């Protein structure tokens, strides 16, 4: 698998970059500002072949649950994915998704639509 920090390699919108709450992997993790329309892009995800993926989000979110679309290459190819509480802003729970990339370089892009989002450390993606 490989490991992609959230706060480096990516495009923010309405989004920012922080270290209060300790515990993420790197050099901080990605505070989503708005309840909809903030976005973390990874613009060079770089897979060894196509086919389905684990995407596993290192995240915190201190109670509730959060809604993201995700969006592979441009394409919204999930709606309103929930991300649950982990309980504190410093626990980092994981969340897995299994998505259809390809081969080469890709890009990954998630997106908040009314419930802000949970912070965002990282995500790591391994071959199904
Ligand atoms: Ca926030
Ligand atoms: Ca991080």
Request: without cysteine; negative net charge.
């Amino acid at each position: 698998g490989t490991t992609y920090e959230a706060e480096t390699g990516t495009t923010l919108t309405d989004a920012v970059v922080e270290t209060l709450y300790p515990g993420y992997t790197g050099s901080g993790y990605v505070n989503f500002n708005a309840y909809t329309n903030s976005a973390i892009e990874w613009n060079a995800i770089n897979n060894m072949t196509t086919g389905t993926k684990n995407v596993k989000f290192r995240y915190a979110l201190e109670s509730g649950t959060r809604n993201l679309d995700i969006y592979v290459n441009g394409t919204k190819v999930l709606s309103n994915e929930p991300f649950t509480e982990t309980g504190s802003w410093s626990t980092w729970g994981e969340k897995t998704i299994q998505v259809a990339m390809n081969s080469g370089v890709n890009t990954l892009r998630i997106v908040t639509t009314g419930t802000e989002g949970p912070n965002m450390d990282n995500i790591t993606v391994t071959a199904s």
